[PDB]
């Protein structure tokens, strides 16, 4: 159980780049980071419009003199103060993640970087080498992985409760972009611009979420080959896809399927992962994150509930209220952010034992997300043929 | 509404080949055929064990002298009687469908043939030419197509309620063969024998069901290309697949996906079809056949119910009881079988107007089912590459 | 499993009174009765309009000379023929059930009587004495009790799987009469006329269905006291109720609740029964009759599926197709009607051993349904006070 | 939308009484209060064990010298400091709510009081008079009322979308106390002690939650009469009930039903409210708080989703993330707590216009909760008879 007791001596001194007044994702970063004394928001470069960034920073309780016009000034000016930031969350559009993360790491700061890490695998490999050389934590906000029942699924699979794993069926298929909403909505507009978004739309934007859930649940699984067929149903998005099918062969013969979509008309979110074994399946759906289907062949189907005593102990650690009270995605994000804070603090203290026991989406998860999108785009561009992973 | 009033002057004089005492499917054929004065069971070759076939025929109320040891004797002996059969249902294992259907057609009998029609497209084309030359009806028991809400979905799509069709997502993924049950179960045993079952297991056995539903809903849709990746997770079934992924490109750019499986551990049936348009999606699930999800992007999701006045008139014709009372797969099969009887009777009477207005799974549907399986096996055998359809 | 093999040597020679061309319930009687060689429809008094009754009888394949204008002529004329009826189903409006059932019993016929048996407990007691004196079977069409999982629930309760029973929560709450549809619909019109319907509307029409399910599941349970508060929300129905709450105390301290409604706007049927024990609950919903919720406190909830090997053997006897294929209310009614036929045939043969092992809704169930409605009306009329049962 | 911008100039200086290290509810108070700069936790009397209260306060970041041994010392010592508390949340067991709230109000502090306000209506009336005389805000943590779709339901009802309201069906029926867990669990133990808990267990503990939801949705509705039948199924709890049925007549003829239970074996929470009108019903379930069923008679059922543009504007104000991302009970509590802070700040500033537009569970809601429990206990003690409300 969590009761708000501190996990580190003092909150990590913290800034955001992006996540400004009109952003989609800025708020959940702060909601999760400020919770339970993990981080303190003392500075930021909140907006591309520096005037609006400072107006908003002040409404967030930030010193107007620590609302900087850009990330370079933020890092340089904060470095001069003994109470300067120790960590920065990057919530800008995708095109700036590489440059901002690189600069933060070279400035000796820990980073939480919005997915994706960057556009290309070569950039991802460079970022990872710079993070490791500078001994910095890089969290990546695969936020759904914060839900307790993802750890339950991992533990059940590891204990052989599904038998031998045969298939991993993943989807993130919503309908919000069935129409060309780019015309009116700035957040969608930049996501269908290859200059600002990169080589893919839905593969990178939504496909990588349930992919990361499969990596938490099946940590030893390795993709041998994949093929990807992708479409721009809203023709103006071409070459960026608003729908894709990724079929994968894992080492050992298991199969993987990822359906990525922003044109699944009527779907509110539709992020699901079903892991199918020789004995049993489990299935999780992000819109109802407090339940996990557990279906042993030839037995009654079961539903596992967040907070119940029959769960693996790893799956009960982060309960903030008793079973039957619904937790949501803010709890999942809070569960990642306190781990980010413990990892950053542990790094500063040289607490190697604590570091090694902490599990969170990190630089390595970020690299794999970029690798997968790049291989999918390579297959799709060659007309949906099998490629070596 | 249906109230049991006759649709033809007299029940079609009818026989079964197969569907004996220990069969899985024999009973639903009779339940549907005998309902509402459609067919009268007057003869049969019910079993590979002729003694057990006659024992069972007598318990079905059939004259023991009209319980014949084989289909050839059935057709020859019945031809001698003025009250001889006019039609025969073929519910034998897959390997005998071609020979029995061919003999029945050449004997001037109407046929209801269990899916699949036969193993090869060349056999299917031959059967169809013989059915047409002899002016015989061949029904095919794509039984799920008898559910009223399949016609509702067809009518909604035709009226543009989904907008332009983008994707057709189909699955028939159950878990009953997660373990090697072939060891104890004769019905599964013959299905994993290529000599008796043919070139595929789950593609032919279950994949063709939701494929046929898509052909009812999207009658003008044409597959341009497909690829199929198939697996034998129970290794002893090789080369017959217990799992398969079929990805299809339709003419006009829409995509199709079929997941066929007998190893989806914990799944009771899992036959679903989701049609996704630019405006809205619909989705139907065979285990809850009296509801149809209708999901307009940006509006509340809706559930359409069997028997309600807001349905298209085609979708209300076959209601046997008021909305809210659950109908099941026996009603769906009864809805096909009365149409089979009307078509057979209309053929005898030369009632061309009635024939042209009747919609049922016919010889042409049977040919397409065989074509699709054959193309999938061709792609799968070449390592899951795109093939022209 | 059922495979259509005869259960009695010859079909019971059978008539209907009512169930004519425009009736709601006539068809499901015939669908269930004619199935599997149980009954043969050889005569009827189908309609209050004798011309329309004969037109319809002929379309049902009945000899026009055995389409009689009334039940008295039916019984008198059939008595003269060696192939005369042996049994009659009564599907007339409620007001005529007593007179028609009494006449059939005095004529030495077995009866299947539509619920309710009659208006008053004194009439019910008289009917029962006449049925017993004449050694006749009286089936009552509590059709939902034919669903296999009702027997599963009975068996689980009897084996202590719920622990000590604490509460029985019952509802049959649909919305079809939220508006005054009596204006246009003859079936609703007679149900809100006390002269033709009797002392209650929804208590008798729908409340008695889940009440009977509780009597199957908890056969030793006895109601000690009840109170009933009833409303006419469509004011013109007064004094007949379109909504009611019945609260009951059982002997031993368990509580019962029945919500009866025709004004639950938006509800398609809403017949549910939840039995709550010290250890676990089970819950069944008529619109999804092939599943049974089984919820052990402190364990994952389970869903039990029709046709699965983990069910009690009593619950597998009536399976007509494999698990995962949806059966519906026609199967439930067919399961009662073959038992009615076996009981009638067993009575004629003096097969006391078979009779004693048969379980079906009978004269005694019919009497209890009338008793419960009468006590509820007595409480409601006294302003919803506790009455001795 | 909420983006974390301040709603008042400075966070309310805040304390808790109770909500200590081992409490069930202490954490959600702090999670909601500290969010978005609403309150600052600067002091507390956290625990009956003052040593453990101070240990925990320090882990919450509170000055050890402002971790006081009791509420009287907290109020007296804080009054001496210019940075003293302005408001206090009371999260002690029920028996101390009256004395602590009274003392806080007399000390000129705003209060958030855990439900229930107190044991007796006479105490409730006294507390309310003292709150009003001292011009203090008293929030009451009917936390479920913070869910956006409760406001959607209120707005739909007010706009006549349900037609005339006929029934209000409420339940809070969980199974966690099916067994005598009081033996091992201190939180359950005090709830079944009349000295510490008061005159009821489940009526007060859970029944009052969906009752308050009905008061938000139907603000002009007035209970004319009610009856209550209550049971102690775990006999040792007598006279405190672990199950109850409350039937109510509203002025104007609508009916209300509340099922309160801690012995609904297998239920994870089971808090539901269904409002049934002449035209349509709506239904909300606390375990899936982001959906609202909307069921127009004779139309397809609909599901309304949190965050969608078709919602009433009142129902979109508190969205913290886009539609399809699940919010939970922490958001609901955060939505109450920021309103509590705005009301307290508005009271200090004399901003009468802002005060009058704020809607939150207040002193008046607290009084009604106590009134309802007291009337239910009065009816139950007289053997479940109608009492004037
Ligand atoms: N579940 C998730 O983890 C999740 C969900 C949504 C968004 N995201 C990711 O978060 C990032 C932002 O997404 P969004 O939807 O919030 O975008 P958005 O367009 O809604 O917000 C962008 C914000 O960054 C600011 N900004 C832009 N350029 C800047 C610069 N150079 N310096 C400082 N501020 C700058 C803008 O003013 C704005 O406040 C993307 O990488 C996106 O993929 C992740
Ligand atoms: N939904 C559907 O349409 C559906 C479902 C299941 C089965 N089927 C099809 O029905 C056919 C039979 O399937 P099943 O599962 O009932 O098989 P099964 O093995 O359970 O039954 C085979 C039956 O045919 C009899 N038989 C075998 N060879 C015969 C012969 N030469 N002459 C006469 N009788 C013979 C057997 O004795 C037995 O009664 C197959 O083609 C299968 O694919 C269709
Ligand atoms: N689940 C169930 O068991 C269920 C469901 C619905 C109906 N019912 C019961 O079935 C009975 C009929 O209900 P319904 O909804 O079908 O009614 P309905 O009004 O739809 O049908 C009445 C039928 O009886 C005929 N009829 C009327 N009076 C007659 C007479 N004196 N002699 C011969 N025929 C006569 C009418 O012409 C018509 O065909 C009622 O008792 C009703 O409660 C039971
Ligand atoms: N949804 C809701 O609003 C909700 C849910 C649960 C609890 N509650 C209410 O919250 C209150 C507490 O419930 P709980 O389940 O957390 O109880 P609990 O027994 O779990 O916690 C009681 C806490 O108060 C402390 N305490 C006890 N007496 C004290 C005193 N005199 N001074 C200071 N601290 C003291 C204890 O040490 C402990 O920390 C009750 O009134 C309960 O009804 C409301």
Q: What is each CA distance from B341 to A383, B1, B139, C172, D55, in whole angstroms? A: 47, 18, 10, 38, 83
Q: Do C179 and D297 touch (CB under 8 A)?
A: yes
Answer for the pair D217, D154: CB distance below 8 angstroms, yes or no: yes
User: Rounded to whole angstroms, how far apart are CA atoms A1 and A5?
Assistant: 11
Annotated binding site of B: 20, 24-25, 48, 94, 97, 114-115, 141, 190-191
Breaks (C-N over 2.5 A) in chain C follow: none
Q: Which ligand is nearest to the CA of D140?
A: 4
Q: Do A298 and C304 touch (CB under 8 A)?
A: no
Give D26 Cα–ligand 4 centroid separation in angstroms.
Answer: 7
Q: Do B330 and C329 touch (CB under 8 A)?
A: no
Residue C260 Cβ < 6 Å to ligand 3: no
D152 contacts on B by Cβ (under 8 Å) = none
Give C20 Cα–ligand 3 centroid separation in angstroms.
Answer: 8
User: Rounded to whole angstroms, how far apart are CA atoms C146 and D208?
Assistant: 40
Structural resolution in Å: 1.8
**Among candidate residues A341, A325, A344, A324, the one with its CA nearest the CA of residue A333:** A341
Give B227 Cα–ligand 2 centroid separation in angstroms.
Answer: 30
Q: Within chain C, where are the H helices?
A: 26-34, 50-59, 71-78, 97-106, 121-133, 148-158, 186-191, 194-197, 202, 208-217, 329-349, 352-357, 363-381
Residue B146 Cβ < 6 Å to ligand 2: no
B3 contacts on C by Cβ (under 8 Å) = 21, 23, 26-27, 56
DSSP, res D64: G
* Identity of the residue in B259, B265, B278 whose CB atom sits nearest the CB atom of A280: B265
Q: Do B31 and C4 touch (CB under 8 A)?
A: yes
User: Rounded to whole angstroms, how far apart are CA atoms D177 and D263?
Assistant: 5
Give A25 Cα–ligand 1 centroid separation in angstroms.
Answer: 6
Most B-contacting residue of D149, D152, D300 (CB-CB within 10 A), to test interface: D300
Residue B187 Cβ < 6 Å to ligand 2: yes
Return the ligand 2 atom nearest residue B49 CA. 37
Q: What is each CA distance from D131 to B214, D17, D38, D110, D357, in whole angstroms? A: 67, 18, 21, 8, 19
Give A198 Cα–ligand 1 centroid separation in angstroms.
Answer: 14
Residue A135 Cβ < 6 Å to ligand 1: no
In this structure, the dihedral spanned by the alpha carbons of residues A37, A41, A47 and A53, taken in order and rounded to 10 degrees, is 130
Q: Which ligand is nearest to the CA of D361?
A: 4
Hey, is C232 helix, strand or coil? coil
Answer for the pair C240, C381: CB distance below 8 angstroms, yes or no: no
Answer for the pair C41, C337: CB distance below 8 angstroms, yes or no: no
Q: Which ligand is nearest to the CA of A143?
A: 1
Residue D204 Cβ < 6 Å to ligand 4: no
Which residue(s) pair with D257 in the sheet?
D169, D247
Q: Do A269 and D27 touch (CB under 8 A)?
A: no
Q: Do C295 and D265 touch (CB under 8 A)?
A: yes
Compare all CA atoms of chain D with the CA of C277 and give the residue at the minimum distance: D265
What's the gap in Å between the CA of C382 and the closest CA on chain B? 34
User: Rounded to whole angstroms, how far apart are CA atoms B18 and B27?
Assistant: 11
Answer for the pair C335, C342: CB distance below 8 angstroms, yes or no: no
* Identity of the residue in C299, C305, C309 whose CB atom sits nearest the CB atom of A310: C299
User: Rounded to whole angstroms, how far apart are CA atoms C70 and B137?
Assistant: 43
DSSP, res D67: B
Hey, is C49 helix, strand or coil? coil
Q: Do C326 and B288 touch (CB under 8 A)?
A: yes
DSSP states along A46-58: --SSHHHHHHHHH
Angle between helices C208-217 and C148-158 (to 10 degrees): 50
Which phi and psi angles does C264 have, rounded to 5°?
-80, 80
Residue B101 Cβ < 6 Å to ligand 2: no
User: Rounded to whole angstroms, how far apart are CA atoms B85 and B363?
Assistant: 20
* Identity of the residue in B27, B174, B268 whose CB atom sits nearest the CB atom of C4: B27
Q: Within B87-147, where are the H helices?
A: 97-106, 121-133
Sign of CA dihedral A364, A366, A371, A372: positive
Residue whose CA is closest, atom 5 of ligand 4? D25
Tokens matching residue A315:
């799956």
Angle between helices D329-349 and D26-34 (to 10 degrees): 60
What's the gap in Å between the CA of C129 and the closest CA on chain B? 34
D26 contacts on A by Cβ (under 8 Å) = 3
In this structure, the dihedral spanned by the alpha carbons of residues C72, C74, C77 and C78, taken in order and rounded to 10 degrees, is -130
When the candidates are 3.30.360.10, 3.40.710.10, 3.40.309.10, 3.30.930.10, the CATH number that belongs to A145-334+368-388 is: 3.30.360.10
User: Rounded to whole angstroms, how far apart are CA atoms B255 and B167?
Assistant: 5
**Among candidate residues A313, A325, B274, D276, the one with its CA nearest the CA of residue C245:** D276
Residue A48 Cβ < 6 Å to ligand 1: yes
Most B-contacting residue of C1, C2, C4 (CB-CB within 10 A), to test interface: C4
Tokens matching residue B190:
């013959």
Q: Do B175 and A281 touch (CB under 8 A)?
A: yes
D350 Ramachandran zone, left/alpha/beta (phi>0; psi -120 to 50): left
Sign of CA dihedral C19, C22, C23, C24: positive
Residue D175 Cβ < 6 Å to ligand 4: no
Residue C23 Cβ < 6 Å to ligand 3: yes
Q: What is each CA distance from C387 to A34, A258, C371, C379, D279, in whole angstroms? A: 61, 63, 13, 6, 34
A302 contacts on C by Cβ (under 8 Å) = 300-302
**Among candidate residues C86, C91, C3, the one with its CA nearest the CA of residue C45:** C91
User: Rounded to whole angstroms, how far apart are CA atoms C111 and D69?
Assistant: 79
Give A91 Cα–ligand 1 centroid separation in angstroms.
Answer: 4
What's the gap in Å between the CA of B129 and the closest CA on chain C? 34
Distance between alpha carbon D132 and the CA centroid of its chain, in Å?
20
Residue C196 Cβ < 6 Å to ligand 3: no
User: Rounded to whole angstroms, how far apart are CA atoms D203 and D230?
Assistant: 9
Q: Do D295 and C267 touch (CB under 8 A)?
A: yes
Q: Do B298 and D309 touch (CB under 8 A)?
A: yes
What's the gap in Å between the CA of C150 and the closest CA on chain D? 19
Question: What are the counts of helices (DSSP H) followed by strands (DSSP E) for chain D?
Answer: 13, 14
Whether residue B28 has a cis bond before it, omega within 30° of 0: no
Q: Within chain A, where are the H helices?
A: 26-34, 50-59, 71-78, 97-106, 121-133, 148-158, 186-191, 194-197, 202, 208-217, 329-349, 352-357, 363-381
User: Rounded to whole angstroms, how far apart are CA atoms B235 and B242?
Assistant: 9
Sign of CA dihedral C29, C34, C39, C45: positive
Burial of residue A69, with CB atoms counted within 10 A of its CB: 0-12 exposed, 13-18 middle, 19 or more buried? middle
A43 CB neighbour count, 10 Å cutoff: 26
User: Rounded to whole angstroms, how far apart are CA atoms A379 and C217?
Assistant: 59
What's the gap in Å between the CA of C12 and the closest CA on chain B? 14
User: Rounded to whole angstroms, how far apart are CA atoms A219 and A215?
Assistant: 5
Burial of residue B175, with CB atoms counted within 10 A of its CB: 0-12 exposed, 13-18 middle, 19 or more buried? buried
**Among candidate residues A114, A285, A266, A93, the one with its CA nearest the CA of residue A194:** A93
Answer for the pair C231, C204: CB distance below 8 angstroms, yes or no: no
Chain D positions touching chain B (beta carbons under 8 Å): 294, 298-305, 308-310
Which residue(s) pair with A387 in the sheet?
A226
How many CA within 13 A on the CB side of residue A311? 26
DSSP, res A205: I
Pairing of strands A12-18, A39-45: parallel
CA angle C83, C84, C85 (to 5 degrees): 120
Residue C73 Cβ < 6 Å to ligand 3: no
Q: What is each CA distance from A54 to A20, A45, A187, in whole angstroms? A: 9, 8, 21
Pairing of strands D301-305, D291-296: antiparallel
Question: What are the counts of helices (DSSP H) followed by strands (DSSP E) for chain A?
Answer: 13, 14
Cβ-based neighbours of A21, under 8 Å, separated by 6 or more: A46, A47, A52, A55, A56, A59, D3, D5
DSSP, res C188: H
Q: Do B281 and A266 touch (CB under 8 A)?
A: yes
**Among candidate residues A198, A191, A203, A200, the one with its CA nearest the CA of residue A258:** A203
User: Rounded to whole angstroms, how far apart are CA atoms A112 and A117?
Assistant: 10
Q: What is each CA distance from D34 to A216, A278, D157, D334, in whole angstroms? A: 32, 48, 33, 9
What's the gap in Å between the CA of D304 and the closest CA on chain B? 5
Give D19 Cα–ligand 4 centroid separation in angstroms.
Answer: 6
Pairing of strands C12-18, C87-91: parallel
**Among candidate residues B173, B271, B184, B188, the one with its CA nearest the CA of residue B237:** B188
User: Rounded to whole angstroms, how far apart are CA atoms A228 and A259?
Assistant: 10
Q: Do D287 and A324 touch (CB under 8 A)?
A: yes
Hey, is A347 helix, strand or coil? helix
Tokens matching residue B102:
């061919």
């Amino acid at each position: 159980m969590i009761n708000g007791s501190k996990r580190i001596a003092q909150p990590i001194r913290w800034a955001m780049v992006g996540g400004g007044r009109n952003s989609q994702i800025g708020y959940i970063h702060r909601s999760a980071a400020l919770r339970d004394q993990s981080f303190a928001l003392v500075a930021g470069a909140f907006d591309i419009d520096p005037g609006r960034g400072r107006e908003f920073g002040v409404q967030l309780g930030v010193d107007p003199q620590r609302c900087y016009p850009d990330y370079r000034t933020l890092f340089e000016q904060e470095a001069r103060r003994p109470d300067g930031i120790q960590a920065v969350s990057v919530a800008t559009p995708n095109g700036t993640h590489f440059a901002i993360t690189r600069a933060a790491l070279e400035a000796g700061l820990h980073v939480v970087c919005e997915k994706p890490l960057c556009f290309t695998l070569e950039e991802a490999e460079t970022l990872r080498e710079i993070a490791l050389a500078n001994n910095r934590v890089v969290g990546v906000t695969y936020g759904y992985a914060g839900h307790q029942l993802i750890e339950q699924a991992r533990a059940m699979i590891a204990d052989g409760e599904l038998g031998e794993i045969r298939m991993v069926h993943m989807q993130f298929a919503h309908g919000f972009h069935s129409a060309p909403v780019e015309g009116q909505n700035e957040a969608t507009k930049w996501r269908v611009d290859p200059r600002l978004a990169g080589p893919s739309y839905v593969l990178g934007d939504v496909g990588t979420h349930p992919l990361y859930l499969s990596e938490v649940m099946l940590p030893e699984f390795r993709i041998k080959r994949l093929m990807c067929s992708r479409q721009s149903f809203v023709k103006s998005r071409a070459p960026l896809e608003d729908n894709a099918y990724t079929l994968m062969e894992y080492e050992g013969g298991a199969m993987g399927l990822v359906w990525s979509s922003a044109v699944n008309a009527g779907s509110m979110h539709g992020q699901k992962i079903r892991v199918i074994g020789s004995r049993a399946s489990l299935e999780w759906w992000d819109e109802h994150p407090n339940q996990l289907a557990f279906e042993i062949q030839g037995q009654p189907v079961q539903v596992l509930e967040r907070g119940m005593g029959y769960l693996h102990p790893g799956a009960l650690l982060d309960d903030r209220i008793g079973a039957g009270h619904p937790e949501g995605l803010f709890e999942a994000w809070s569960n990642l952010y306190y781990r980010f804070a413990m990892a950053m603090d542990a790094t500063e203290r040289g607490d190697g034992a604590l570091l090694a026991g902490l599990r969170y989406p990190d630089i390595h998860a970020g690299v794999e997300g970029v690798r997968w999108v790049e291989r999918c785009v390579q297959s799709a561009d060659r007309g949906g043929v099998w490629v070596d992973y």
